Design a binder for this molecule. Structure first.
Ligand SMILES: Oc1cc(O)cc(/C=C/c2ccc(O)c(O)c2)c1
Ligand SMILES: Oc1cc(O)cc(/C=C/c2ccc(O)c(O)c2)c1
Lengths: 116, 114, 116, 114
């Protein structure tokens, strides 16, 4: 899987389930074009967003709808969303895992990049 | 100081000095309009971005040019930038500190609202 | 697997491979008794530390030898190790994932606790 | 101030106030001897733990009583405490800030050495 997203909840010590994720790619005209979307599973993971053929060099944005997640739990959170912007595949195809660890007033994110 | 930004470097254990920070506010047309900018000081801090009168309720984005910071240290980083998007002052002025802890492939951010 | 450890490297964007992990359990006399040890695999994961029968209620410490890891990469790090101390299984058996994200002067850790 | 501790709360977006902090130094017999302690202030900070003369090279542990903090807010936390173990001053005095960002099932810590 060339792009996978994993989301964890630091308040409950659980995967963050049913979180909406939207991925965009920067187009020739410098606008964000929709690329893929989905929701995290019971394991906090979102697989199957793209394929190796479609996931070309470019600048991508992964936007995680953290606000809806916290509001459904009864918490008014600080951020509107958590997003990650990165260049992908500029030295050839790679596999990317984007992980995010969420709290109401904080988030942490890391990337794991592997060469298949 | 209604809005302060503090940036720390997790590789060197130091403030992140001379990092460019741009602040935007969301305009009626769902576009990001420039609002303030600066570069962090020797303590990793950026003060004096705005005043209580100008800092009204709304949606703000703080964008930190992390890529230029790591390139200057000879490290190839993952992110194009680190950004933080939040609603402020929806219930009137407050004091906001946005902190960011940087590594080449990761960042953490928190808000201290007092 | 009742106890799994996952270790990631925030400098290189990779799993932290070959990291030593030592687990201890607090004994009746308030000393730390050795419980299990291992090293992380190529995926940054350490499985097979214990079994459901051996992993009883108690206070456990997971100690990750981050110092050796960074020194092998040429970096003199701040911490002597990263450790996590927690009570386990006090409301019945659970499955624990302890994750750590490492940098030379910082670490983050989270737990994911699931009810099998 | 050669050693300062700052503690932040990621759930409420605030300093972590009135948190107990104990500092230990490793003794010749590989035992932890008490060295300093205090509780964080309204800004989440603990100053005045030690002096330059007393703070010699060695191995120190900072232990933060996170469990009592979350219990006071009615949240059941994962960790017994958060602790940070490091070597100081091996090349003579420096100024150390140990920061910790707390959530019920997670903590992050960094050091700022200036
Ligand atoms: O920014 C952070 C901070 C942190 O403390 C942990 C993570 C990631 C944890 C993780 C846990 C289980 C996984 O399978 C996985 O891929 C990642 C990310
Ligand atoms: O492990 C982490 C993660 C993070 O996202 C932030 C911090 C520290 C924030 C901070 C905020 C205000 C201060 O004065 C200060 O010294 C530090 C530490």
């Amino acid at each position: 899987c060339p792009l996978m997203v994993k989301v964890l909840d630091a308040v409950r010590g659980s995967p963050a389930i049913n979180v909406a994720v939207h991925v965009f790619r920067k187009a020739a005209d410098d606008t964000w074009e929709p690329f893929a979307s989905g929701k995290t599973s019971e394991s906090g993971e979102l697989h199957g967003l793209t394929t190796e053929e479609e996931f070309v060099e470019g600048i991508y944005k992964v936007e995680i709808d953290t606000k809806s997640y916290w509001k459904a739990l009864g918490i008014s959170p600080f951020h509107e969303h958590a997003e990650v912007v990165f260049t992908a595949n500029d030295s050839g195809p790679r596999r990317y895992t984007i992980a995010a660890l969420l709290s109401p007033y904080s988030y942490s994110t890391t990337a794991v990049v592997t060469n298949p």
